[PDB]
Design a protein around this nucleic acid. Structure first.
Ligand SMILES: Cc1cn([C@H]2C[C@H](O)[C@@H](COP(=O)(O)OP(=O)(O)OP(=O)(O)O)O2)c(=O)[nH]c1=O
Ligand SMILES: *[C@@H]1O[C@@H]2Oc3cc(OC)c4c5c(c(=O)oc4c3[C@@H]2[C@H]1O)C(=O)CC5
Ligand SMILES: [Ca+2]
Ligand SMILES: [Ca+2]
Ligand SMILES: [Ca+2]
Length: 342
DNA sequence: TTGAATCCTTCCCCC
DNA sequence: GGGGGAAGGATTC
């Protein structure tokens, strides 16, 4: 049938800060985003493996990370740059099979189904690709290879970092039963729990229960996706994809409810969101507000025409007025999301 | 100074 | 009953 190749860049942001300043290598590096809330306020975007050995990983507040590795290099995240270094690497890949996906700023799938005859020749295209990326951009990436996207990615997860691994149909059969289901692409612990207290702890356990008992627990989508993976009928194609939305959320010094105190933050967001749109006209706008207790509340409005900057400002303030009206908590983070492009 | 994509469940129109 | 679709959430990486 087919052979899907998965490329995923190792500790990407951290590594981009490394390549851009070689001195950092071998030393713990932690890329984080400081919110002016107070000093060291913020979380950790990511950390190279040095720091990651000792517990410092993406998500933990940076204060907790500084109590663990008070002498690691902490750097502010610069998205724009990573973005370009990604785009660059995402082209060297187009040169191995126009059938490319691109799941994120660091993940992409290739259907080298035609450029290769056997897995063995795949392991070769794998090293070729790794090698070309390492020479041209100085970045280390892991490669996964199998019969379909899901497993191609599982291969990469098993070979991180700077790894290469193929999973043939014998491993798949094996993994269908032995591979812990919580380690399957698309099963956040929230779904890993509903599955746990339902009998399904392995990919194969999904065949046991009735289909409409799943459809009512985890939804139809997750249910069909899982069964097809369990029965070995998963065969999703590698489809190119486009950004279906652009936004920006900002943290405020203090939590408040005063429209006049939040407005300016909301504009900064609206202002940057349009810079990101570049040459695109959106038709729907959303204002998301992160409550004082870290809960998300949003409000939208779709127009029959595009949204000009002036109407985004105006329409954004009403939606906000509607959020405070329908909620009681104080706002912490505020932002906008522009979708449904022209 | 941090995204963004699916999927879902609910609601409202109307043939 | 069923096709449409907009919306405010739920979930995942
Ligand atoms: C998890 C996470 C990722 N990111 C971004 C930064 C990273 O470079 C990239 C996410 O990490 P991942 O791309 O999922 O994995 P990684 O390769 O960078 O990590 P690993 O060392 O396991 O190989 O996405 C954030 O900004 N915040 C987060 O909380
Ligand atoms: C949404 O707000 C934070 O900002 C980001 C940005 C990410 O990538 C650019 C990101 C990723 C992941 C994640 O779990 O969170 C974020 C976040 C935070 C979210 O709370 C991933 O698994 C991959 C990228
Ligand atoms: Ca990744
Ligand atoms: Ca990665
Ligand atoms: Ca998981």
């Amino acid at each position: 049938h087919m052979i899907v190749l998965f490329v995923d860049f190792d500790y990407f942001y951290a590594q981009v800060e490394e390549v851009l300043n070689p001195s950092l290598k071998g030393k713990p590096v932690v890329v984080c985003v400081f919110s002016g809330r107070f000093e060291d306020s913020g979380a950790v975007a990511t950390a190279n493996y040095e720091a990651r050995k000792f517990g410092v990983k993406a998500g933990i507040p940076i204060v907790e990370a500084k109590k663990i590795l008070p002498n690691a290099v902490y750097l502010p995240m610069r998205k724009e740059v990573y973005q370009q270094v990604s785009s660059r690497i995402m082209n060297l890949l187009r040169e191995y099979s126009e059938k490319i996906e691109i799941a994120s700023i660091d993940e992409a799938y290739l259907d080298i189904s035609d450029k290769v005859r056997d897995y063995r020749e795949a392991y070769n295209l794998g090293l070729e690709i790794k090698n070309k990326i390492l020479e041209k951009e100085k970045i280390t990436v892991t490669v996964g290879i199998s019969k379909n996207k899901v497993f191609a990615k599982i291969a990469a997860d098993m070979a991180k970092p700077n790894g290469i691994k193929v999973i043939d149909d014998e491993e798949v059969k094996r993994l269908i039963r032995e591979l812990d289901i919580a380690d399957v692409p698309g099963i956040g612990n929230i779904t890993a729990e509903k599955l746990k207290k339902l009998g399904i702890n392995k990919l194969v356990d999904t065949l046991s229960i009735e289909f409409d008992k799943l459809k009512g627990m985890i939804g139809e989508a997750k249910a069909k996706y899982l069964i097809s993976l369990a029965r070995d009928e998963y065969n999703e194609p590698i489809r190119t994809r486009v950004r279906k939305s652009i936004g920006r959320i900002v943290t405020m010094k203090r939590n408040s409810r005063n429209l006049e105190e939040i407005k300016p933050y909301l504009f900064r967001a609206i202002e940057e969101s349009y810079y990101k749109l570049d040459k695109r006209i959106p038709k729907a706008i959303h204002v998301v507000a992160v409550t004082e207790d870290l809960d998300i509340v949003s409000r939208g409005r779709t127009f029959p025409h595009g949204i000009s900057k002036e109407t985004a400002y105006s329409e954004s303030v009403k939606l906000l007025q509607k959020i405070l009206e329908e909620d009681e908590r104080k706002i912490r983070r505020i932002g906008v999301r522009f979708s449904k492009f022209i």
